[PDB]
Amino acid sequence: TPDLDAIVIGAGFGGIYMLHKLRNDLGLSVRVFEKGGGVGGTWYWNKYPGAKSDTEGFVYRYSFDKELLREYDWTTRYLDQPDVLAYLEHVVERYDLARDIQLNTEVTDAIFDEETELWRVTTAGGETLTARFLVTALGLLSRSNIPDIPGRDSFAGRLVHTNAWPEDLDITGKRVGVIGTGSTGTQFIVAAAKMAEQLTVFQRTPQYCVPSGNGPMDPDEVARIKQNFDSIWDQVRSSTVAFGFEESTVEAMSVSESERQRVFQQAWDKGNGFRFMFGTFCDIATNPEANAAAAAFIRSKIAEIVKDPETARKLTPTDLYAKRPLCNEGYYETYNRDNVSLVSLKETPIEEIVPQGVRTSDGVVHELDVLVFATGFDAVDGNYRAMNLRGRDGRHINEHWTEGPTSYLGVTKAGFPNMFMILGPNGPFTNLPPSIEAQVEWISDLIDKATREGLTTVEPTADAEREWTETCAEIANMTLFPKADSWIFGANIPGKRHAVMFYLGGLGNYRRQLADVADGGYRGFQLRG
Ligand SMILES: Cc1cc2nc3c(=O)[nH]c(=O)nc-3n(C[C@H](O)[C@H](O)[C@H](O)COP(=O)(O)OP(=O)(O)OC[C@H]3O[C@@H](n4cnc5c(N)ncnc54)[C@H](O)[C@@H]3O)c2cc1C
Ligand SMILES: NC(=O)c1ccc[n+]([C@@H]2O[C@H](COP(=O)([O-])OP(=O)(O)OC[C@H]3O[C@@H](n4cnc5c(N)ncnc54)[C@H](OP(=O)(O)O)[C@@H]3O)[C@@H](O)[C@H]2O)c1
Ligand SMILES: CCCCCC(=O)O
Structure with missing residues (x-):
């Protein structure tokens, strides 16, 4: 027993x-x-x-x-x-x-x-x-x-994974390095760029990202939502992705070029990466022209937002819009900040972590006080x-x-x-x-x-x-x-x-x-x- x-x-x-x-x-x-x-x-x-x-x-x-x-x-x-x-x-x-x-x-x-x-x-x-x-x-x-990056344990400053973030660590005014640019990396970067004296991004593979639409709730909208909560949950439970929106039943290639642009723009303006991947057209993730069109839409926004052409180039992925879809509050605009630097690991791979920072294949030692691993799970x-x-x-x-x-x-x-x-x-x-x-x-x-x-x-x-x-x-x-x-x-x-x-x-x-x-x-x- x-x-x-x-x-x-x-x-x-x-x-x-x-x-x-x-x-x-x-x-x-x-x-x-x-x-x-x-x-x-x-x-x-x-x-x-x-x-x-x-x-x-x-x-x-x-x-x-x-x-x-x-x-x-x-x-x-x-x-x-x-x-x-x-x-x-x-x-x-x-x-x-x-x-x-x-x-x-x-x-x-x-x-x-x-x-x-x-x-x-x-x-x-x-x-x-x-x-x-x-x-x-x-x-x-x-x-x-x-x-197991070479030299990782030699780093003299604070080295942390995002999933082990210590409550005492304040990165305000410090020289911060982050490795990884998924959903964790990218939202860290946005917030961290407001805090750190310098933020250095070590990016192996760039990702597509859309606006989150984040902002304050109005008590009337909260009331409205709560009045209708039974209905809202019924929708959620019969949906595909359960994010509280109805997934589109429109094939992306079945409308005009102007219509694709407008539907994407409308989803970009409202925000949410799941909304952009699933509430726009029904085949972003199954039809390759539909996917390529979603992806090119995002690339055009990168090139518009990011003022430094080199940074824009490094930020612009060339692969499928088919990873977990990201959103953030102004992710690409963050790279117009003067305290943010982007290193591409495709061009300059990390050779060694050293006591004072990260040495990349180019010979450059990026000097840092904090090294953040947003390298996932x-x-x-x-x-x-x-x-x-x-x-x-x-x-x-x-x-x-x-x-x-x-x-x-x-x-x-x-x-x-x-x-x-x-x-x-x-x-x-x-x-x-x-x-x-x-x-x-x-x-x-x-x-x-x-x-x-x-x-x-x-x-x-x-x-x-x-x-x-x-x-x-x-x-x-x-x-x-x-x-x-x-x-x-x-x-x-x-x-x-x-x-x-x-x-x-x-x-x-x-x-x-x-x-x-x-x-x-x-x-x-x-x-x-
Ligand atoms: C930064 C971030 C943002 C996210 N955003 C979203 C989102 O927008 N939407 C969404 O749906 N999901 C999101 N997720 C995923 C999220 O994990 C789920 O929403 C949810 O929190 C999972 O809850 P869970 O109880 O299954 O697992 P977890 O919350 O991961 O809890 C698992 C627990 O098990 C404990 N544990 C593990 N192994 C052992 C062991 N051997 N012995 C004892 N204890 C153990 C762990 O320490 C941990 O506390 C996000 C995840 C992260 C990290
Ligand atoms: N906003 C949210 O709701 C939110 C926030 C965080 C997490 N999440 C959930 O958690 C999941 C995991 O998110 P995540 O961003 O923590 O992990 P991730 O999506 O697995 O991203 C890992 C990042 O680290 C990079 N990386 C891995 N190994 C590396 C190496 N050896 N050297 C250099 N770079 C390396 C990856 O590059 P490559 O792509 O080249 O491998 C990628 O940029 C998300 O997809 C999402 O489901 C959600
Ligand atoms: C397994 C993760 C499912 C989607 C919720 C998220 O991307 O955070």
Whole structure:
């Protein structure tokens, strides 16, 4: 008989909600282990300047509690890291969840014990305990990726990853270097350029970026949104990307050149990178002329905004508009600042980090006090592979994932009885809170069913999982997304497999898949009594 009914790993959006359901709704004995010193997951760790979410604030939140929806106010269109952290803290208080969240506790081992049919979980702290159900809410974008750049550890000043931003660090008036220009890099750069004495950008691959449209909320708009929240959430849940806008059904090449320009301009003026990729035309990410047209539209704005022709050239990507789409408050305009310098690593690669800065292949030592790694994450599977996580057959999860990470439905794993993942591999690529709520609710129901019916294990079959791999691959091969090199398909860490790691059918379709599996009696699962 186990120490706990369930153990949940992680105290981000995922685990907070998981806990709430397993404890407050099902009345189970549950504990959460979180390695951080406080709850919030992403929004605990990512304390860097400019950290914020690109999901517009009205839908970057839970939806399951209608009271909370209507009581909580947000004051700017998009939510800053501190505003989201404060929200997740308020949820934690609201639901009396802190008492079952054990902070500072890294789970190092999770071992299915076939004798007892229980999960045995070990912490860095040398606690081992048993639970019937394990839920892993480890975060898709949680495990910092810090490349082994030569000389990195010789750097004399403050060297930090964005995902480890120390609360004491004030970059005001300092000479700041940043490596990486994805969504983290670029929003850091915008905010950091207002603070630092000099900001040096080390850019390996330029990205496309559109305006965010960020700005203050009017209390009447907040009221309007809240009046209509039921409707708003219905739209979200039947949408593709769940960002609170209706995706376009217009093929981009089916209108005039003037119409393409106007639709793009209109989306540019309103802002949001997901709006620009999906609310403009329906085939930006499937049709290559449609994509090329979106991309050229962005290039023309770079060339207009950026006054130095050389900087504009270095900023202008030539590859597909098919990475996670960015937005920012005046990203390209930042490079007209006099305290910002752009180094292209295609032309002048980093040779060595040295005590006083970064020496590039040109021989130039860029002298710096702070070196910021916005070099992203061992995404999706990183925290799973770094855990001593072993299933029924005693094999480490790495031995099940030799071609890429796998699951059934993004939330279960063949060979891993009674384990459920929140934002596991091959789940939705959407505004994440509502995908999380879908997962959590679905897991709950199943755990509750095993409970009421006296099941001992629940496990997806090997065939069900391999069917889901097929599905995810086939959906991704109908898109351009696999032709974009990023973390989304792995390989952003040399030696990491290149592989499909998301269900790209969208939230509405992903919810339907979940509800079909439930409602048909969990075909694909072995339900042992
Ligand atoms: C800068 C930034 C901006 C983003 N903007 C958006 C956005 O606009 N829209 C959007 O949908 N998503 C965005 N995301 C993704 C974001 O991660 C999700 O929105 C959401 O916060 C995920 O919550 P989660 O609980 O699944 O994972 P996380 O919030 O990543 O929480 C996972 C937790 O698990 C803990 N943990 C991991 N492994 C272990 C272990 N072995 N033992 C113990 N604890 C462990 C971690 O320390 C972490 O606290 C953004 C991410 C970042 C980093
Ligand atoms: N605004 C938001 O809502 C927001 C903010 C931050 C993060 N996020 C989410 O988090 C995801 C990850 O974002 P991210 O920007 O943190 O990571 P990222 O998209 O993985 O970008 C990593 C950056 O570091 C660079 N890089 C990696 N290895 C390097 C090396 N060895 N040398 C030099 N440069 C290197 C990459 O260049 P290459 O492209 O050449 O590899 C890229 O510019 C986003 O895509 C998004 O989903 C969202
Ligand atoms: C896995 C990430 C899904 C999209 C939310 C984001 O880009 O932050």
